[PDB]
Amino acid sequence: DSMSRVWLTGDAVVDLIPDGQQHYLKCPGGAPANVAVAIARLSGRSAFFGRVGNDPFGRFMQQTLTDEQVDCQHLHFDPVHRTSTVVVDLDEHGERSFTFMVKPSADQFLQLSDIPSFQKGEWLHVCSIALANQPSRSSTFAAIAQMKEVGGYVSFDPNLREEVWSEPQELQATVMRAVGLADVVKFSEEELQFLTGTQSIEEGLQAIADFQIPLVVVTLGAKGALVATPNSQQIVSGKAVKPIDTTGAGDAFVGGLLYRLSVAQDWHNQATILDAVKWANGCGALATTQKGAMTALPNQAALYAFLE
Amino acid sequence: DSMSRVWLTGDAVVDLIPDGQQHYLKCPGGAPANVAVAIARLSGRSAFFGRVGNDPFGRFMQQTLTDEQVDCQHLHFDPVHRTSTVVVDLDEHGERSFTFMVKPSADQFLQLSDIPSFQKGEWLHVCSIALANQPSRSSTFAAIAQMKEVGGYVSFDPNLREEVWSEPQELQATVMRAVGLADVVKFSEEELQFLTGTQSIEEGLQAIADFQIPLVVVTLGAKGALVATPNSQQIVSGKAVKPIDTTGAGDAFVGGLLYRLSVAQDWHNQATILDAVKWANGCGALATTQKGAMTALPNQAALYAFLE
Ligand SMILES: Nc1ncnc2c1ncn2[C@@H]1O[C@H](COP(=O)(O)OP(=O)(O)O)[C@@H](O)[C@H]1O
Ligand SMILES: Nc1ncnc2c1ncn2[C@@H]1O[C@H](COP(=O)(O)OP(=O)(O)O)[C@@H](O)[C@H]1O
Ligand SMILES: OC[C@H]1O[C@](O)(CO)[C@@H](O)[C@@H]1O
Ligand SMILES: OC[C@H]1O[C@](O)(CO)[C@@H](O)[C@@H]1O
Ligand SMILES: [Ca+2]
Ligand SMILES: [Ca+2]
Ligand code: NA
Ligand code: NA
Numbered sequence A, B: 001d002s003m004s005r006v007w008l009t010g011d012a013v014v015d016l017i018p019d020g021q022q023h024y025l026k027c028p029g030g031a032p033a034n035v036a037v038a039i040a041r042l043s044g045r046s047a048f049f050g051r052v053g054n055d056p057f058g059r060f061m062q063q064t065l066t067d068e069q070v071d072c073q074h075l076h077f078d079p080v081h082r083t084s085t086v087v088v089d090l091d092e093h094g095e096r097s098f099t100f101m102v103k104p105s106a107d108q109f110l111q112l113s114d115i116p117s118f119q120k121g122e123w124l125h126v127c128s129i130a131l132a133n134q135p136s137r138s139s140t141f142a143a144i145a146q147m148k149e150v151g152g153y154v155s156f157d158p159n160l161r162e163e164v165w166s167e168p169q170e171l172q173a174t175v176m177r178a179v180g181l182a183d184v185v186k187f188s189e190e191e192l193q194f195l196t197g198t199q200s201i202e203e204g205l206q207a208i209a210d211f212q213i214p215l216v217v218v219t220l221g222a223k224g225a226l227v228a229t230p231n232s233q234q235i236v237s238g239k240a241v242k243p244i245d246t247t248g249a250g251d252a253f254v255g256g257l258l259y260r261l262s263v264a265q266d267w268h269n270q271a272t273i274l275d276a277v278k279w280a281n282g283c284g285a286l287a288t289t290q291k292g293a294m295t296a297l298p299n300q301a302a303l304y305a306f307l308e
Helices: A031-041 A056-067 A136-150 A168-179 A189-196 A201-207 A249-262 A270-287 A300-307 B031-041 B056-067 B136-150 B168-179 B189-196 B201-207 B249-262 B270-287 B300-307
Strands: A006-009 A013-018 A023-029 A046-053 A071-078 A084-088 A098-100 A123-127 A153-157 A184-188 A215-219 A225-229 A232-236 B006-009 B013-018 B023-029 B046-053 B071-078 B084-088 B098-100 B123-127 B153-157 B184-188 B215-219 B225-229 B232-236
Touching: A006 A031, A006 A136, A006 A249, A013 A056, A023 A031, A023 A056, A031 A046, A031 A056, A031 A123, A031 A249, A046 A056, A056 A071, A123 A136, A123 A249, A136 A153, A136 A168, A153 A249, A168 A189, A184 A189, A184 A249, A189 A201, A189 A215, A201 A215, A201 A225, A215 A249, A215 A270, A225 A270, A232 A270, A249 A270, A270 A300, B006 B031, B006 B136, B006 B249, B013 B056, B023 B031, B023 B056, B031 B046, B031 B056, B031 B123, B031 B249, B046 B056, B056 B071, B123 B136, B123 B249, B136 B153, B136 B168, B153 B249, B168 B189, B184 B189, B184 B249, B189 B201, B189 B215, B201 B215, B201 B225, B215 B249, B215 B270, B225 B270, B232 B270, B249 B270, B270 B300
Parallel strands: A006 A046, A006 A123, A013 A084, A046 A071, A123 A153, A153 A184, A184 A215, B006 B046, B006 B123, B013 B084, B046 B071, B123 B153, B153 B184, B184 B215
Antiparallel strands: A013 A023, A023 B023, A084 A098, A215 A225, A225 A232, B013 B023, B084 B098, B215 B225, B225 B232
16 A cells, blocks of 8 residues: 555646657656656656646647546646646756747646545645736645645756746745745756756755755756755766656656655655665666657666666 | 739648657747748748747747848747747647637737838738737737738738637727738638638628728638639639648648739739739749648749649
């Protein structure tokens, strides 16, 4: 029974990824959708709550999630607003590679009544787009508070996309409020430095010390990940691959991480955490092997073969 | 000198058109953009005024128009809003084939100061999306009034896309206000019946009689076009083709029509009008031969070869 449900909330998105001159691949995406699918592919128990648009992209994302055996009972169609649609520039990476065409998209209209019943020991994973505008911002903070209240665990990956914020001057403080609520926080190197105003990972980690975050993980691209827990920092690294498409690699990482925490007896244990990050690294690498955030999210047969 | 400038205003759009499973063609589109390019390809003098987004789709549409030798001096980038992005379903046709992902897109924020200087004898062509929301609605009606004031001519093609209207209950009356301002109005059969609440072209034309519109043209798909001028109705038809893609065929039609009116000594003359509609029909047919509204917009060598 120790396989705990992981709830994902936020933006399911169609990522339009160049593939041939004059053509886009229609790729399912959206960071929390990506994480959900990553966990399901590893045979985990994931479930999504949020809003997409009542449009073909929204229906495509519902179909995708259900095909991937992600529970979508709590994925709702907004009656007015459209599904997020993102154009990817493959000459860039991460935030710089995305243009958001729909602002505010349906997910930004998440309401308190959209939040499902949570149980002790469950996980909730959130990214910063969910915090970008109201009412999703306040609804998502309420979801976090409710998960904490019931004795669940909260994972946060800022996954910064500034252009989504109608008030970008609110990003830093709003994101850092969520960082202070979380049990697990994952940053890219650049995101940690940006949110703390620092020029190195060392200074960045010192700047978040007072938050007393139980587990911080800083991805280092090819160099793997820095795992920071109380009074300990350790780099965990595996095989570097040449990425074909970096889109969503950090979400694959989170997916492997949370899958392994979710099936642990006691996720707080250092051995469990380090192993979970080993899986995260393998997932992140494999995810880069095909275009589309979800396309090469691995199953266990593939991951074990790669980690061996 | 008798080649008069035709001004086009409204929405330049990226149309995402299925082409292979999992792929979209990235096709330039937007009815008034289509009309502009149709006129330019026939060696006419066309110019566009309006707003796209400060984004890659907006820049792509600017590039497209300038490549097609459409004057874009007055195409501006909106600082906030995104370029219209439309998903096409090729199992449907016309309005029913389009899903608008960006609402309100940049073009809906057309301001009075975006209107260029007009001169006597020039043409202005408008479609109903320009009237869908404020401030574009009032700005566009002002542009129409200014063109009338200076002794130019106004062309209107409702080109109905209801979903773009935040207040769809305003569509009928707003559209019909523009119909009453125009020198030339082009309807599809279905659009004429919808806007007049009638069940036939005959009743539809009777219902707009009091408007005293100088030239009404009703397209009849494969059967060509009905040309209604005072006390006269005449069907003009040419070679029917099997359409490969109907997207924008009605805009190609308008393009050929207005190109020929724009180069006429006296466009009011029945011979000039009938010839212009013959060109319109040929353009509409040829436009269907490739995917994308603009792709097969013909040049004169192609059109003459087809009409012969
Ligand atoms: N070149 C690489 N080789 C091996 N693993 C990688 C490589 N790049 C990324 N990863 C894995 O994915 C994580 C971050 O990748 P990233 O490119 O930032 O993806 P994304 O930006 O979409 O989140 C790293 O922690 C690592 O585990
Ligand atoms: N099957 C056809 N054969 C010949 N001409 C056509 C055909 N279909 C459309 N046209 C031309 O284009 C016009 C309308 O086509 P349509 O399919 O409604 O294009 P759109 O809906 O994009 O405006 C007609 O008036 C006609 O001149
Ligand atoms: O993490 C990658 C994902 O992040 C997004 O930019 C926003 O959710 C998506 O476009 C992409 O799939
Ligand atoms: O007339 C066809 C054109 O009309 C639109 O639906 C709206 O402007 C575009 O998507 C398409 O190119
Ligand atoms: Ca990321
Ligand atoms: Ca039309
Ligand atoms: Na991928
Ligand atoms: Na075409």
